[PDB]
Design a protein around this nucleic acid. Structure first.
Ligand SMILES: [Mg+2]
Lengths: 87, 95, 97, 106, 82, 97, 106, 95
DNA sequence: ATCAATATCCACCTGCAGATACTACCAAAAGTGTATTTGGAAACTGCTCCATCAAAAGGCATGTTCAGCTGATTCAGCTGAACATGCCTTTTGATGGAGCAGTTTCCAAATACACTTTTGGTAGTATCTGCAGGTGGATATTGAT
DNA sequence: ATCAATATCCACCTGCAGATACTACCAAAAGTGTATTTGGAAACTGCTCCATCAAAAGGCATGTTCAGCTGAATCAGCTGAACATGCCTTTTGATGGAGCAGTTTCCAAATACACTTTTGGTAGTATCTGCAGGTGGATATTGAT
């Protein structure tokens, strides 16, 4: 392999309109301007927690590839069971 | 070319009985398959624990029955309990 | 020139998004965030595409349900506007603290 | 040769279930009634959800049950909702629900 | 002087609980709401404990019956065995 | 004639009860309630002494923690007085409703 | 004969842990080092809590660890608190904590 | 009459290593015993799942280690891991 | 501010509930030796599907505008905190008996094991159909006036 | 209420992705049938420890009074919604290649007895002591003036 792009600040790919849509689905009518950064922070913590466990399952299996099943077991561990992906 | 089992065909049989003209998408089938596996694991688990708590090495329909009562809410438990009792009773008389 | 009043398009969007089931975050941006976070735990990881989709369904369902709790905390305060304090209260009561 | 399923009058596979109880390390021994009772509970539960989901599909002028229909079925039923209270159905969305104070005028 | 059993959970007792919870001021309607909440709590837990009792073929609810009931309700208790 | 102001004793009591660990419901009435509730599931039951104790400890821990959440809900609404709506919000967010 | 605990440098009983793993329906087989590892982990966490609970006894002018002391140790420690975040220690009470807004105005 | 096993003696030993002049009430000892039982079950439970997920028939210290990483918070995990590895080394290099 | 009521702190005293130390005991682990079973790493290799890329399709960013929401201010009136004590409920302890738990027993049902049938999954090729997404064209809903 | 901008609602309409259809095969299920082991129910019973109650303890029901909190009303300020506008980024389809996963060989490690030794739990008995209450005396806090 020759070169691989640096990943930084991808949290901002979670845009104001994307977050507003999620709030709409959750029944929110009016959104303070500070909600967007708070939400990004909250989502980061959520992902860190799930990805950490998921990746732990990956390494235990001695794989380089994080599977749908690694994620599904990570979610089950955290009491956020997901149906729809083999789990 | 390893074989992957699912409850799909049995979910489909039961679907035809309740709604003969209705189909199911593969994604909905995948969720149905996850639901059956999930409930399976939850009942087996309680039955496992229950057996251990009473110093028993055997999981019998009795353990499954208590597990069902512990696991399912009110009316679903009541009906599940009849369905499983009925099936065992029938099964006993049938050999 | 025509204008809807503040709140009217907002309720329209609530009906629209409560009606449908598609993911609300763009795929690639979400995929990059996943890879960024994972890379910080462990380098040279690959992802099955369904693994990314799984994380997306789980994260979007988590955020939608958090926003409902948040909305309830706002309304408790006699407001209609969600603030960071509402999210924080929801998370505290949920035992995410 | 009659399957243990037909013997118990069941669609769900008793044999499969007996096997899964063994490989699953739940106990030293599995009683013969256990997979029979379990397979019926499982069949009952799936009948209950397909009934309700089938209805949501019909209510939506649809012939095919999709994940949204399963979610409407589960969330609209008090008992299925509680049984699956910590479960997420991918591509299910939410129930339409807007809080009172949010509606216009008075 | 006949009194309902739930009413045996008295205002001062509920007041003390609130206090340990750091509550300074308490509305009059709280006492009834609390009793309701306690009743739902005990129903859920006792239901499961008794279910464990019946399974063992006993007529006595044991500390373990209760401790196991609590564990499966996600309210693990330490101090009484297990 | 000497009188303490509203909230002075309340604070004094918070301090007192946060210091100690004794149960704060009287044993007997609690025991009756437990027995009454159990009678609807099975008749002619007996209770180990420690069984009732375990229930009391669990019930008091639960209620004490719910009052903390309730109090946060009252303060969120900019009050210092707990109301049933505060307990209701705390339970709804906890996922008990 | 020299015990496995003494071999591993541990106060916690390897033999017992090994036995409990076997009869716990955890898997068909249990590797030789697994009970050793597990016993070490359990001893370690025990020491961690007894360390901090001992200290809380000291701070409160006492030599006997009571449940109150185990409670203070666990909830004053961010990590032990998280591990035991869904556990109730009987006769532990709560941390002294009053919301600032409830304090009298100076 | 029947034997009631407990971690009491081993917990008391560790107490003396850590605070030789401090004692422990019965109730506190009973809590410590629950704690050890609870953590055991959590860790063995996870190790069980890990082995099963990976189609393995044996729970090895590798599974115990991964279980610990999945269950313990950061610093707690780190030490438990090193305590565990340390004990498995000492046990290997012992005749 | 001072002043007095009463809560709170701390040093010292002490009885006994609850901790600990000890011996003789026995069932039951836990450990040691030897015969046997097998689970899983390694080594090779078919092949899925993941990373990556070029074109095509639609959502995002940004600035302006002002509607109406939030949060500050004030105020009256309602509602909960504080208060004192004998009634009455709970606590404490003393005593018969229910049932839990420990023991032996013996057989219905469990595991094991081996040829024998059945079937659920796939895989390769084929034809089928429900509905998403496009359209145009009639019926609300919303907000200015 | 009336007029008009724009969202919304069907109804019908073509392509097609995804679903249902078969024919052929097959490895592994699942069943069948018989020999071999045993878990746990069933029955009897000893002794905890539980429900009950008598005598002692001591917390709480009670109504009064008013501090101070809650919620209504009013309003200025400014934040956040709507929408126009300009265009970047994602979505979608297509294609070499890493690593996952399938199969098979091969030994280090774990199960399975049995036999030999010890340790941990109970129990009987007696022994020890940390500290919860109680006292007594100084000092801080709170509330009144
Ligand atoms: Mg990085």
């Amino acid at each position: 392999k020759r070169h691989r792009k640096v990943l930084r600040d991808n949290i901002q790919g979670i845009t104001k309109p994307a977050i507003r849509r999620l709030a709409r689905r959750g029944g929110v009518k009016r959104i303070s301007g500070l909600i967007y950064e708070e939400t990004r922070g909250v989502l980061k913590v959520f992902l860190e927690n799930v990805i950490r466990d998921a990746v732990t399952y990956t390494e235990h299996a001695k794989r380089k590839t994080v599977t749908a099943m690694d994620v599904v077991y990570a979610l089950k561990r955290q009491g956020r069971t997901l149906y729809g992906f083999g789990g | 070319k390893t074989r992957k089992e699912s409850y799909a065909i049995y979910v489909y049989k039961v679907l035809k009985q309740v709604h003969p003209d209705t189909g199911i998408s593969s994604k909905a089938m995948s969720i149905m398959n996850s639901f059956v596996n999930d409930v399976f694991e939850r009942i087996a688990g309680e039955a496992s624990r229950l057996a251990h708590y009473n110093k028993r090495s055997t999981i019998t329909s009795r353990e499954i029955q208590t597990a069902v009562r512990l696991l399912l809410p009110g009316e679903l438990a009541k009906h599940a309990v009849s369905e499983g009792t009925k099936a065992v009773t029938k099964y006993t008389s049938a050999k | 020139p025509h204008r809807y009043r503040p709140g009217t398009v907002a309720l329209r969007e609530i009906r629209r998004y409560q009606k449908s089931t598609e993911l609300l975050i763009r795929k690639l941006p979400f995929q990059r965030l996943v890879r960024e976070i994972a890379q910080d735990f462990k380098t040279d990881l690959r992802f099955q595409s369904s693994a990314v989709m799984a994380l997306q369904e789980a994260s979007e369902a988590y955020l939608v349900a958090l926003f409902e709790d948040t909305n309830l905390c706002a309304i408790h305060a006699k407001r209609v506007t969600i603030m960071p304090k509402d999210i924080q209260l929801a998370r505290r009561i949920r035992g995410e603290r | 040769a009659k399957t243990r399923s037909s013997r118990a009058g069941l669609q769900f596979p008793v044999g499969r279930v007996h096997r899964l109880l063994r490989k699953g390390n739940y106990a030293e021994r599995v009683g013969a009634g256990a997979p029979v009772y379990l397979a019926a509970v499982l069949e009952y539960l799936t009948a209950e959800i397909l009934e309700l989901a089938g209805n949501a599909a019909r209510d939506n002028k649809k012939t095919r049950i999709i994940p949204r229909h399963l979610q409407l079925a589960v969330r609209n039923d008090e008992e299925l909702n509680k049984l699956l209270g910590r479960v997420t159905i991918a591509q299910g969305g939410v129930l339409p629900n807007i809080q009172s104070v949010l509606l216009p005028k008075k």
